[PDB]
Amino acid sequence: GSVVIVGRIILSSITAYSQQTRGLLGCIITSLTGRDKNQVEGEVQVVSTATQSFLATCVNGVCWTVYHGAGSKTLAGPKGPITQMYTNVDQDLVGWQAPPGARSLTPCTCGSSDLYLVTRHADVIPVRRRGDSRGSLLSPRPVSYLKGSSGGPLLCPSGHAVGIFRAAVCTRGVAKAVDFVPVESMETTMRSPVFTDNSSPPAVPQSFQVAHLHAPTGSGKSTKVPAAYAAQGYKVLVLNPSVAATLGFGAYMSKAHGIDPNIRTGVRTITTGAPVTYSTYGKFLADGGCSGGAYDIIICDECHSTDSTTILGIGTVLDQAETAGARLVVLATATPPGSVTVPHPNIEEVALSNTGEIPFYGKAIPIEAIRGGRHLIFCHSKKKCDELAAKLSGLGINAVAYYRGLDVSVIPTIGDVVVVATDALMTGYTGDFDSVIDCNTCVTQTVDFSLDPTFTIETTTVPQDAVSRSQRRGRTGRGRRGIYRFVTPGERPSGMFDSSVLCECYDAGCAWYELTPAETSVRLRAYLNTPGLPVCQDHLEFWESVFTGLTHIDAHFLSQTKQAGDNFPYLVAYQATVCARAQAPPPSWDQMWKCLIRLKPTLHGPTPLLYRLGAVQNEVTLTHPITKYIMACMSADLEVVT
Amino acid sequence: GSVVIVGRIILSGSGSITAYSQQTRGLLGCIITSLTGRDKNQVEGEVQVVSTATQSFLATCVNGVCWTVYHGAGSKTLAGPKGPITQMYTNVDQDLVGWQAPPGARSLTPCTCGSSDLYLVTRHADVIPVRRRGDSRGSLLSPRPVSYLKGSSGGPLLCPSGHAVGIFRAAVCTRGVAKAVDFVPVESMETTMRSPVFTDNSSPPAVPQSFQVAHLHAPTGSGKSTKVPAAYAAQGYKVLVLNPSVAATLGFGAYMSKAHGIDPNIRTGVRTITTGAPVTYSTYGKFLADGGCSGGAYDIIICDECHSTDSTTILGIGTVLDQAETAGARLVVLATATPPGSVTVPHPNIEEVALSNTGEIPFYGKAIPIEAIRGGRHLIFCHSKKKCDELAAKLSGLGINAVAYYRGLDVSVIPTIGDVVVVATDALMTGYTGDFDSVIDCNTCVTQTVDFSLDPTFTIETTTVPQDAVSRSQRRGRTGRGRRGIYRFVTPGERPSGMFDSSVLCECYDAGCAWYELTPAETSVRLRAYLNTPGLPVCQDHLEFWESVFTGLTHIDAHFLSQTKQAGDNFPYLVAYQATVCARAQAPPPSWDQMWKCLIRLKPTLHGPTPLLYRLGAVQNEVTLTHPITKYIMACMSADLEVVT
Ligand SMILES: Cn1c(C(=O)O)cc2cc(Br)ccc21
Ligand SMILES: Cn1c(C(=O)O)cc2cc(Br)ccc21
């Protein structure tokens, strides 16, 4: 899929109008071919993916738009797809060399405070400049009005570009201010080198440094490079999200490099006295982060990972490493933000068809492709894993399901098997497979500020991103020839995560790591202020404010939601506490509210509902002080992408 | 475009009822087949996954007919082997449409046994147990979020032996949780299949011996409002002619004296005459203001423009349907050019021309050539007052006599002699009767939608929607009347006709309260009559819900109510009731938008969070949810609400 020009906003006293140039059929053919013979006119383009419509603004002979809209996509152009000239995920900025015909807006220099936002509807909105990247809407407007206007210009009165619109600053669903990428950020990006080589590890600097290591899985990132640093006389800590990978680095280093390292996981610790320690982010956070003086180098491996333990773990590194006497933090990944899945020499890629014995996500699997050999099938849910493995078992194929809750001993280490797994496989099991078959979808959590009364955590099935695709396919072609079969060919942009992940960090801080919400903010700020990492809307102040109010949890409910292993154990147990103490029933009797079953005959009346973590069957009361408190928290400025 | 089969749900042949999906087309494939109507792919399976350019849903073959919901498929064709397949059955009232399937398609067959253990087959190929609790109802064994059931309209309910019981059409919701399912029973299907494909309704009915409701689907200009009462009166019958617009009411009345030889009675707010003639022209407003049917006065009631889904027309017709038999009438004629399920077909007098990007005048993403509007008397439809004023100002610059018409303007602002361009909203068709040399159409309009948003209660959202078949026909119809005309459009195509939103039911109870002195109970009776009469525009039955809401909105300030009435804006009762609660709490309104202007006077004295009852627009001020009326309306949200899927 390419980005497609589907129309234009013509600019002039600043007045505007829109001209559509493409319908649906055209847009979708042009996205697929990447070839657009249509003539480019004007400085503001109305642009489109298959999922989303937005704006693109030409300044300085570059067509700019937002990374959250365009990802790392090509622009359809005359002689074919144009690859992006600039990709800045930290600034939320992309750019393509401006197609022939397109005029540019000149940057604004003569610092005006009267700004005008051009929208997709061709409206010209007064905006008073505040900060470098902020302007206040003179007439506050509902956020929905500003949707699809991302990438549109903010103009000073002379009609010169101050920057491009990227986000609305919300009070209870009403946009009061706008967040824009400034023209100065574009200039910086135009001056930065297009390809920067981060394939080799840095030499340990004299003063503290954060370096980036972009090199494939098993290129040495986590074995050869800690070994080589130790050989120079350094103490190295290597952090990995996976227990199985941390434990497995231990035997690989004893054989390949003659170091018996320290190993640190929840399940198993080995202290040898060695200058190399492998630990998971979790066990590191459990141990209370950086040990003063213990390490010269910290290597944060798989730093594209956007689970809450990793982000909190990395943000702890970034806030504590220099004071603890470290000289080097290496953020290490094969899939940095902005990365795209490209052909692999060892991996033959084959689309699923409709012909085959085994139904799979609307397509089919031939029995021949998986009868014999060791194969991995990725499913989105545990229910799909059980159904598929039961089918395969009846069909006489030796088949096994793996997901969260299951012990990894379900997987045979040798002989024929089809493993039917969720992404839990990434942290439980280290092995590779003759083929990988991928559903190309995953379960994700999103926050919705639904004001009904407060917020909602939603569970949705979404298409995979570039990180998911590459990590799934990377289970084959590992020093062997591999096959990769897929339902769908596409991938979402990589290096972005949802605000519910922030909430999850605060939850885990409170539930597991005995971290105050204030301490969680410090660690997360460190993560957010470090470029080259995945990006999130800055909702640290809001999330801090709601967890701050969650005082005096029942330790027995918290223990129980912790033991049960499910998400948001702190939020779940804090709802249960409010219910038990209000002598009131839970939102429903789902397995989530298990901890309240011994109180089921005594709890009557409306639920003191705090927030929505699933379906609410019972009648609700909005009268609880905690509810009133989380409702006040909703008045916070929330930056939301438009 | 057409409805396109994009895949299928394969059902188990033996043992427990299980199911899997087969995806047969992608997005590109879908959109080519939608335009051409030509689908050379083979039809396998009973349950199809069908798609339009906007929604996606299910269809089930039962007895050689591929069945689905009207609210998904509208009156659209199905892509087939030798081109598009026209619908064989369209039933808006049952919410059921059917195409003759291809020879060799597999159909389900009805449930012979009549069991109470049911199974809903969803579009994700999930088979979910339902307990039957009525002819058209079933309880979900495990209640689920509504979202999960979306896209599964047209799917089958199966008995424990894999036979069709009905087709899914809606979820029954308590506060976002589907607890039950509504379906079209297989009985309703087989009725339809035994019945005439073709029904007349083109000619005015004979007056029956006893009370009957008849439908008159005849062109606008076949004299449905002039010729047909005049012919009924010439036969000795007393006839009442009801119309949405006062301009059409006075217009018809004046035509009758001029042509058909009757000085009729006129009943409108602005002009009332009693001649004692056997014909009476009236607006639905004045009819409702007079307190409905007067006993023994009329033998025949013509409800003209009965496709109109404004609150006064619905309330008007609903009253006639509830009172006419008891008042001794013999006949109710429901008269429209564009009935539910109707479709815009070509007119012989009207040339239809798509707008290009080439032209001096920017118009909704395309352009009007300046030369097209230089020559004569032309009408330009715009969705908003803003767009009208901004366009009439541009044409004023370009040396064109352009005038703006919208609600709140005098129609005398528009001339009769030729040269003119009138830039109008839909208010034109109720305010002004004249025809034009050409019509230019934006193909969009402004509508209101309810959202049950539980934040604290409900939202009335104002939104710009693609026009529907009714909108297209009525707008096009202001040209080519008896002579040649020209119709220019931005977008071809139209949404389906004869459906309206729950918020219109809200508006009826509001208008009952504000204008017509009807208790919510009284309004319920009138609307029940309207929803129970087939052949009329359709709506989700949220009568009990809306009656409960308005039942609690007591002791409104008479002054604020009179102000919202006079100002002419929507929901004058809800606006004035929210303001009443604000004033009496000394609280500010939800915002300082024009909606809340009855409080401007009081702005110095208003402080604190607004006690928010419901949302009628943006809310800028801080809110409190502790008001007894907020609590009461939150309590009303527990109602079983039927929502489509
Ligand atoms: C219920 N569920 C499953 C599943 O196994 O079905 C996977 C998963 C992931 C997230 Br994040 C949230 C909920 C989830
Ligand atoms: C503000 N507005 C306009 C306008 O002229 O802008 C048209 C319209 C129609 C409905 Br229904 C509700 C509100 C509306």
Side-chain angles (χ1 to χ4, degrees), chain A residues 542-562:
Chain A
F542 169 73
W543 288 122
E544 191 190 315
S545 82
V546 339
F547 284 83
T548 302
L550 276 15
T551 58
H552 310 102
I553 212 171
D554 183 288
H556 189 226
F557 297 153
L558 182 55
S559 162
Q560 277 186 275
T561 69
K562 269 168 72 182

mmCIF file of all heavy atoms in Angstrom, chain A residues 542-563, unseen atoms left out:
data_model
loop_
_atom_site.group_PDB
_atom_site.id
_atom_site.type_symbol
_atom_site.label_atom_id
_atom_site.label_comp_id
_atom_site.label_asym_id
_atom_site.label_seq_id
_atom_site.Cartn_x
_atom_site.Cartn_y
_atom_site.Cartn_z
ATOM 1 N N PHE A 542 -1.810 12.745 33.699
ATOM 2 C CA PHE A 542 -3.136 12.109 33.861
ATOM 3 C C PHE A 542 -3.065 10.775 34.583
ATOM 4 O O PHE A 542 -3.671 10.636 35.644
ATOM 5 C CB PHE A 542 -3.853 11.910 32.508
ATOM 6 C CG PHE A 542 -5.091 11.028 32.591
ATOM 7 C CD1 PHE A 542 -6.269 11.503 33.173
ATOM 8 C CD2 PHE A 542 -5.076 9.723 32.092
ATOM 9 C CE1 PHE A 542 -7.397 10.688 33.270
ATOM 10 C CE2 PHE A 542 -6.217 8.909 32.182
ATOM 11 C CZ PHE A 542 -7.367 9.398 32.771
ATOM 12 N N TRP A 543 -2.324 9.793 34.015
ATOM 13 C CA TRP A 543 -2.173 8.456 34.606
ATOM 14 C C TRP A 543 -1.608 8.488 36.041
ATOM 15 O O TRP A 543 -2.044 7.713 36.896
ATOM 16 C CB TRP A 543 -1.363 7.492 33.694
ATOM 17 C CG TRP A 543 -2.102 7.034 32.478
ATOM 18 C CD1 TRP A 543 -1.716 7.188 31.179
ATOM 19 C CD2 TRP A 543 -3.369 6.359 32.442
ATOM 20 N NE1 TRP A 543 -2.668 6.651 30.336
ATOM 21 C CE2 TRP A 543 -3.692 6.141 31.083
ATOM 22 C CE3 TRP A 543 -4.268 5.913 33.429
ATOM 23 C CZ2 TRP A 543 -4.869 5.494 30.682
ATOM 24 C CZ3 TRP A 543 -5.450 5.294 33.025
ATOM 25 C CH2 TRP A 543 -5.721 5.063 31.667
ATOM 26 N N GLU A 544 -0.655 9.385 36.299
ATOM 27 C CA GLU A 544 -0.107 9.589 37.647
ATOM 28 C C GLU A 544 -1.209 10.017 38.573
ATOM 29 O O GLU A 544 -1.326 9.453 39.666
ATOM 30 C CB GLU A 544 1.028 10.630 37.654
ATOM 31 C CG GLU A 544 1.787 10.685 38.967
ATOM 32 C CD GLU A 544 2.758 11.835 39.129
ATOM 33 O OE1 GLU A 544 3.521 12.126 38.177
ATOM 34 O OE2 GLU A 544 2.765 12.434 40.228
ATOM 35 N N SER A 545 -2.036 11.006 38.118
ATOM 36 C CA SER A 545 -3.125 11.559 38.916
ATOM 37 C C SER A 545 -4.166 10.495 39.299
ATOM 38 O O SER A 545 -4.643 10.525 40.422
ATOM 39 C CB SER A 545 -3.739 12.785 38.246
ATOM 40 O OG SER A 545 -4.691 12.488 37.244
ATOM 41 N N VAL A 546 -4.502 9.538 38.417
ATOM 42 C CA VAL A 546 -5.560 8.593 38.803
ATOM 43 C C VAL A 546 -4.990 7.570 39.811
ATOM 44 O O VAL A 546 -5.683 7.286 40.791
ATOM 45 C CB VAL A 546 -6.415 7.968 37.632
ATOM 46 C CG1 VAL A 546 -6.354 8.801 36.354
ATOM 47 C CG2 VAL A 546 -6.172 6.472 37.375
ATOM 48 N N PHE A 547 -3.738 7.034 39.595
ATOM 49 C CA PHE A 547 -3.155 6.051 40.510
ATOM 50 C C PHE A 547 -2.864 6.641 41.894
ATOM 51 O O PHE A 547 -3.035 5.935 42.886
ATOM 52 C CB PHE A 547 -1.936 5.345 39.911
ATOM 53 C CG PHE A 547 -2.283 4.302 38.875
ATOM 54 C CD1 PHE A 547 -2.524 4.664 37.546
ATOM 55 C CD2 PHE A 547 -2.373 2.957 39.220
ATOM 56 C CE1 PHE A 547 -2.851 3.699 36.585
ATOM 57 C CE2 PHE A 547 -2.698 1.994 38.256
ATOM 58 C CZ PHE A 547 -2.931 2.375 36.948
ATOM 59 N N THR A 548 -2.441 7.934 41.961
ATOM 60 C CA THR A 548 -2.299 8.714 43.206
ATOM 61 C C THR A 548 -3.550 8.601 44.127
ATOM 62 O O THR A 548 -3.394 8.410 45.341
ATOM 63 C CB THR A 548 -1.915 10.174 42.887
ATOM 64 O OG1 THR A 548 -0.704 10.168 42.136
ATOM 65 C CG2 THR A 548 -1.690 11.016 44.138
ATOM 66 N N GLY A 549 -4.754 8.704 43.546
ATOM 67 C CA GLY A 549 -6.008 8.540 44.285
ATOM 68 C C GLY A 549 -6.338 7.135 44.775
ATOM 69 O O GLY A 549 -7.203 6.982 45.640
ATOM 70 N N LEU A 550 -5.655 6.093 44.235
ATOM 71 C CA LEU A 550 -5.944 4.681 44.503
ATOM 72 C C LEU A 550 -5.222 4.191 45.778
ATOM 73 O O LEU A 550 -4.415 3.258 45.744
ATOM 74 C CB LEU A 550 -5.618 3.828 43.248
ATOM 75 C CG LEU A 550 -6.683 3.676 42.090
ATOM 76 C CD1 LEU A 550 -7.854 4.695 42.141
ATOM 77 C CD2 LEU A 550 -6.044 3.695 40.763
ATOM 78 N N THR A 551 -5.537 4.830 46.915
ATOM 79 C CA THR A 551 -4.898 4.599 48.220
ATOM 80 C C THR A 551 -5.582 3.477 48.996
ATOM 81 O O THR A 551 -6.789 3.313 48.870
ATOM 82 C CB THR A 551 -4.892 5.899 49.045
ATOM 83 O OG1 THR A 551 -6.238 6.366 49.227
ATOM 84 C CG2 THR A 551 -4.052 6.988 48.403
ATOM 85 N N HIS A 552 -4.817 2.708 49.801
ATOM 86 C CA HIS A 552 -5.337 1.663 50.711
ATOM 87 C C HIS A 552 -6.054 0.511 49.999
ATOM 88 O O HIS A 552 -7.194 0.196 50.334
ATOM 89 C CB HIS A 552 -6.245 2.251 51.827
ATOM 90 C CG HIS A 552 -5.637 3.401 52.559
ATOM 91 N ND1 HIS A 552 -6.010 4.703 52.283
ATOM 92 C CD2 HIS A 552 -4.697 3.409 53.531
ATOM 93 C CE1 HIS A 552 -5.293 5.461 53.098
ATOM 94 N NE2 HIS A 552 -4.488 4.727 53.867
ATOM 95 N N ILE A 553 -5.394 -0.113 49.023
ATOM 96 C CA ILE A 553 -5.891 -1.328 48.382
ATOM 97 C C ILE A 553 -6.017 -2.459 49.415
ATOM 98 O O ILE A 553 -5.320 -2.451 50.423
ATOM 99 C CB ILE A 553 -4.973 -1.720 47.203
ATOM 100 C CG1 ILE A 553 -5.788 -2.399 46.094
ATOM 101 C CD1 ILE A 553 -5.034 -2.635 44.768
ATOM 102 N N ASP A 554 -6.913 -3.417 49.178
ATOM 103 C CA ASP A 554 -6.950 -4.635 49.973
ATOM 104 C C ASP A 554 -5.859 -5.552 49.414
ATOM 105 O O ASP A 554 -5.933 -5.976 48.256
ATOM 106 C CB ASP A 554 -8.340 -5.292 49.908
ATOM 107 C CG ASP A 554 -8.520 -6.540 50.753
ATOM 108 O OD1 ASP A 554 -7.960 -7.591 50.384
ATOM 109 O OD2 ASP A 554 -9.279 -6.480 51.741
ATOM 110 N N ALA A 555 -4.842 -5.839 50.257
ATOM 111 C CA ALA A 555 -3.675 -6.651 49.947
ATOM 112 C C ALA A 555 -4.034 -8.081 49.511
ATOM 113 O O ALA A 555 -3.312 -8.657 48.686
ATOM 114 C CB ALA A 555 -2.747 -6.684 51.149
ATOM 115 N N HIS A 556 -5.142 -8.649 50.064
ATOM 116 C CA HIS A 556 -5.614 -9.984 49.702
ATOM 117 C C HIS A 556 -6.226 -10.048 48.326
ATOM 118 O O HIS A 556 -6.004 -11.040 47.636
ATOM 119 C CB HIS A 556 -6.562 -10.589 50.744
ATOM 120 C CG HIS A 556 -6.864 -12.033 50.471
ATOM 121 N ND1 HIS A 556 -8.159 -12.527 50.534
ATOM 122 C CD2 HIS A 556 -6.025 -13.044 50.122
ATOM 123 C CE1 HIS A 556 -8.065 -13.816 50.236
ATOM 124 N NE2 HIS A 556 -6.799 -14.171 49.978
ATOM 125 N N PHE A 557 -6.999 -9.022 47.914
ATOM 126 C CA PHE A 557 -7.470 -8.902 46.527
ATOM 127 C C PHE A 557 -6.307 -8.711 45.552
ATOM 128 O O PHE A 557 -6.317 -9.318 44.488
ATOM 129 C CB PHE A 557 -8.496 -7.760 46.348
ATOM 130 C CG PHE A 557 -9.801 -7.866 47.104
ATOM 131 C CD1 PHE A 557 -10.506 -6.723 47.467
ATOM 132 C CD2 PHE A 557 -10.337 -9.108 47.439
ATOM 133 C CE1 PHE A 557 -11.710 -6.822 48.166
ATOM 134 C CE2 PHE A 557 -11.546 -9.200 48.137
ATOM 135 C CZ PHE A 557 -12.222 -8.059 48.493
ATOM 136 N N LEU A 558 -5.312 -7.873 45.918
ATOM 137 C CA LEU A 558 -4.158 -7.523 45.077
ATOM 138 C C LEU A 558 -3.302 -8.760 44.829
ATOM 139 O O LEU A 558 -2.998 -9.060 43.661
ATOM 140 C CB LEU A 558 -3.342 -6.376 45.715
ATOM 141 C CG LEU A 558 -2.110 -5.820 44.967
ATOM 142 C CD1 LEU A 558 -2.456 -5.358 43.544
ATOM 143 C CD2 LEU A 558 -1.536 -4.636 45.721
ATOM 144 N N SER A 559 -2.938 -9.479 45.924
ATOM 145 C CA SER A 559 -2.303 -10.802 45.923
ATOM 146 C C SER A 559 -3.046 -11.722 44.956
ATOM 147 O O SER A 559 -2.430 -12.314 44.065
ATOM 148 C CB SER A 559 -2.293 -11.383 47.345
ATOM 149 O OG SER A 559 -2.086 -12.787 47.406
ATOM 150 N N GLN A 560 -4.363 -11.816 45.119
ATOM 151 C CA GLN A 560 -5.222 -12.656 44.281
ATOM 152 C C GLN A 560 -5.207 -12.297 42.788
ATOM 153 O O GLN A 560 -5.140 -13.203 41.959
ATOM 154 C CB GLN A 560 -6.653 -12.648 44.815
ATOM 155 C CG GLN A 560 -6.908 -13.616 45.956
ATOM 156 C CD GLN A 560 -8.374 -13.583 46.261
ATOM 157 O OE1 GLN A 560 -8.850 -12.729 47.016
ATOM 158 N NE2 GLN A 560 -9.140 -14.413 45.564
ATOM 159 N N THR A 561 -5.269 -10.992 42.437
ATOM 160 C CA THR A 561 -5.258 -10.575 41.018
ATOM 161 C C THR A 561 -3.877 -10.729 40.430
ATOM 162 O O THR A 561 -3.746 -10.905 39.216
ATOM 163 C CB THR A 561 -5.863 -9.169 40.765
ATOM 164 O OG1 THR A 561 -5.015 -8.166 41.314
ATOM 165 C CG2 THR A 561 -7.291 -9.025 41.270
ATOM 166 N N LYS A 562 -2.853 -10.655 41.297
ATOM 167 C CA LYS A 562 -1.449 -10.881 40.955
ATOM 168 C C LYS A 562 -1.197 -12.358 40.620
ATOM 169 O O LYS A 562 -0.721 -12.659 39.521
ATOM 170 C CB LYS A 562 -0.544 -10.385 42.081
ATOM 171 C CG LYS A 562 -0.127 -8.934 41.895
ATOM 172 C CD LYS A 562 0.533 -8.335 43.142
ATOM 173 C CE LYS A 562 1.926 -8.841 43.431
ATOM 174 N NZ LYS A 562 2.469 -8.251 44.679
ATOM 175 N N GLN A 563 -1.538 -13.266 41.570
ATOM 176 C CA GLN A 563 -1.558 -14.721 41.402
ATOM 177 C C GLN A 563 -2.270 -15.179 40.132
ATOM 178 O O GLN A 563 -1.760 -16.066 39.453
ATOM 179 C CB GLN A 563 -2.173 -15.405 42.630
ATOM 180 C CG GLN A 563 -1.207 -15.580 43.799
#
